[PDB]
Amino acid sequence: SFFPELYFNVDNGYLEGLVRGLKAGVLSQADYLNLVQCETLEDLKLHLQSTDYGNFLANEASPLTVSVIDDKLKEKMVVEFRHMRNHAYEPLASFLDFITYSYMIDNVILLITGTLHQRSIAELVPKCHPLGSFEQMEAVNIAQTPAELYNAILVDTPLAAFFQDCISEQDLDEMNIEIIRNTLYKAYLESFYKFCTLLGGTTADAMCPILEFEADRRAFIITINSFGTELSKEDRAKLFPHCGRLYPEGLAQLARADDYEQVKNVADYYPEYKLLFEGAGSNPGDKTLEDRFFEHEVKLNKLAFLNQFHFGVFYAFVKLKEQECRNIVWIAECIAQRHRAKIDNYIPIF
């Protein structure tokens, strides 16, 4: 674009090359045919050792399990992301901090209600999802005091700014944990969108549409889901993110929605995701609606990869790598289950 190239390359050549190469570092489709063709866990180890992945089952349990496959995929992901985030710079470092803050709020909601209930905090440490870090103190050994964690997490933990909405220590008990997580997800997401818009380059250009898509899709799925729960339509509109094309129009019809057909009509207002609707076969041995959503994510990830002077390439690599781990562990799951009629719930990425 106008500002980058002369200034992008100087401090982004390494990371651009790294994301390109690590896109190339995913398992080839020939490797995938090796994966499906063994139908055994020992041979699964054998030929995953022979690809980019693998050679990581050393010092592990002789009875290879699917959970070990999940752990190794996630360890590869977190290793690659610690590699990328270790080398960064205030704009892009901040970008990757946003990329991580979603999992931060997830793990942080895992930590909360481990201390409102009388449970150990060392108990909580090994169960955190990777990337969690949490090397910051005042949140550990809190003596089971809600106010201690409240102040610990307003003061010390980096994402304290979003908890200005989650205050008063009353929501901890009177209100659901999940609804709190949803408010924080919304507030964080809109803050991230505003940060993206502040950086008004091709970063904004490539990140606006995908954030609008994420807001639109999450409003779509949540509206589908809550037809069997206790929630009113105004408290409903309260927690839909503002950063979406729906806020201009489409969110109102979702608020008016009460069943599958009104949300179908909402999808029909916009041809881009109507197509994602009619791919919701949900057949035993094929893909489902969520898989078509992930597929559209993959397409937008490729579109981000096409451009080269922005920062959505790394977010694209996030979503693709998550899909890839979902595929490999799922293949391991169906290998252990021995049910080959049902291996088809994974989306190859590259």
Partner 1 sequence: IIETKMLMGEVMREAAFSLAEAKFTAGDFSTTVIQNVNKAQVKIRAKKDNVAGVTLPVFEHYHEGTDSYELTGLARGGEQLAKLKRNYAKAVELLVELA
Partner 2 sequence: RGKLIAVIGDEDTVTGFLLGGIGELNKNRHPNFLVVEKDTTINEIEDTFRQFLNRDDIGIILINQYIAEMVRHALDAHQRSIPAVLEIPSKEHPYDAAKDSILRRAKGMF
Site residues for partner 1 per CB under 8 A: 109-110, 113-114, 127, 129, 178, 181-182, 185, 218, 221-222, 224-226, 228-229, 290, 326, 330, 333, 337, 342, 345
8 Å CB contact between 300 and 195: no
How many residues are recorded in the chain? 350
The residues that touch partner 2, with contacts defined as CB under 8 A, are 61, 63, 66-67, 118, 336-338
> Which one-letter DSSP state was computed for residue 127?
G
Residue 192, CA atoms < 13 Å, CB-side half-sphere: 28
CA distance 219 to 186: 11
CA distance 105 to 338: 36
| Encoded amino acid at 275, one letter | L
8 Å CB contact between 186 and 238: no
Question: Nearer to partner 2 by C-beta: 115 or 202?
Answer: 115
CB of 47 to partner 2, least distance (A): 20
CA distance 100 to 159: 11
Question: Nearer to partner 1 by C-beta: 178 or 259?
Answer: 178
CB of 240 to partner 1, least distance (A): 12
The item of partner 2, partner 1, none sharing an interface with residue 170, based on CB under 5 to 8 Å by kind, is: none
CB of 224 to partner 1, least distance (A): 7
Question: Nearer to partner 2 by C-beta: 6 or 61?
Answer: 61
The item of partner 2, partner 1, none sharing an interface with residue 237, based on CB under 5 to 8 Å by kind, is: none
Question: Nearer to partner 1 by C-beta: 110 or 199?
Answer: 110
CA distance 102 to 188: 8
Question: Nearer to partner 2 by C-beta: 59 or 118?
Answer: 118
Residue whose entry in the numeric block shows the structure tokens 């008990």: 173
For residue 93, which of 170, 195, 162 has the smallest C-alpha distance? 195
The item of partner 1, partner 2, none sharing an interface with residue 330, based on CB under 5 to 8 Å by kind, is: partner 1
CA distance 330 to 336: 10
Residue whose entry in the numeric block shows the structure tokens 């994974």: 346
Question: Nearer to partner 2 by C-beta: 324 or 333?
Answer: 333
The item of partner 2, partner 1, none sharing an interface with residue 61, based on CB under 5 to 8 Å by kind, is: partner 2
Question: Nearer to partner 2 by C-beta: 119 or 194?
Answer: 119
CA distance 108 to 317: 24
- Torsion region of 219: left, alpha or beta (phi above 0 gives left; psi -120 to 50 gives alpha): alpha
CB of 134 to partner 2, least distance (A): 23
CB of 81 to partner 1, least distance (A): 17
The item of partner 2, partner 1, none sharing an interface with residue 113, based on CB under 5 to 8 Å by kind, is: partner 1
CA distance 116 to 207: 38
CA distance 340 to 338: 6
Question: Nearer to partner 2 by C-beta: 67 or 136?
Answer: 67
CB of 331 to partner 1, least distance (A): 12
Rounded-to-10 torsion of CA 342, 224, 232, 178: 40
The item of partner 1, partner 2, none sharing an interface with residue 336, based on CB under 5 to 8 Å by kind, is: partner 2
The item of partner 1, partner 2, none sharing an interface with residue 338, based on CB under 5 to 8 Å by kind, is: partner 2
The item of partner 1, partner 2, none sharing an interface with residue 182, based on CB under 5 to 8 Å by kind, is: partner 1
CA–CA distance from 145 to each of 38, 165, 174 (Å)? 53, 20, 16
Question: Nearer to partner 1 by C-beta: 150 or 294?
Answer: 294
CB of 336 to partner 2, least distance (A): 5
CB of 22 to partner 1, least distance (A): 22
The item of partner 2, partner 1, none sharing an interface with residue 121, based on CB under 5 to 8 Å by kind, is: none
Residue whose entry in the numeric block shows the structure tokens 């949900």: 282
